[PDB]
Design a protein around this ligand. Sequence first.
Ligand SMILES: O=C(O)CCCC[C@@H]1SC[C@@H]2NC(=O)N[C@@H]21
Ligand SMILES: [Zn+2]
Ligand SMILES: [Zn+2]
Ligand SMILES: [Zn+2]
Length: 115
Amino acid sequence: GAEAGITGTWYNQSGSTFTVTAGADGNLTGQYENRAQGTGCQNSPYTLTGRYNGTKLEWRVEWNNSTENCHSRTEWRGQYQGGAEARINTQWNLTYEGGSGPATEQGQDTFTKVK
Ligand SMILES: O=C(O)CCCC[C@@H]1SC[C@@H]2NC(=O)N[C@@H]21
Ligand SMILES: [Zn+2]
Ligand SMILES: [Zn+2]
Ligand SMILES: [Zn+2]
């Protein structure tokens, strides 16, 4: 089914990569390696969990593992682009402990699939 188009390795404009397995059941499971300069929790793999349906994808990475804890998480909501160079256009929300309660940052990531 469609899951074939998603499963593999992707990268964004910041050099972050993720490896995902997309299940025919809609499940998204993988590992994310963050390389956005200046941000915490770079390099080491963090678990990705998400879902997809039609052209729409969403996934979550909680930025705590055995090597670094950034007291934050990011949720991406995206849409798939088809062939030649497959693409996922996303908007993300990063929720973190701000000092007087949770805070959120927003941004956009474009992922391109590794050939
Ligand atoms: O600094 C943190 O709290 C954890 C690292 C967050 C990295 C962000 S998530 C959205 C954006 N896209 C990336 O690949 N890295 C940054
Ligand atoms: Zn299938
Ligand atoms: Zn499954
Ligand atoms: Zn915390």
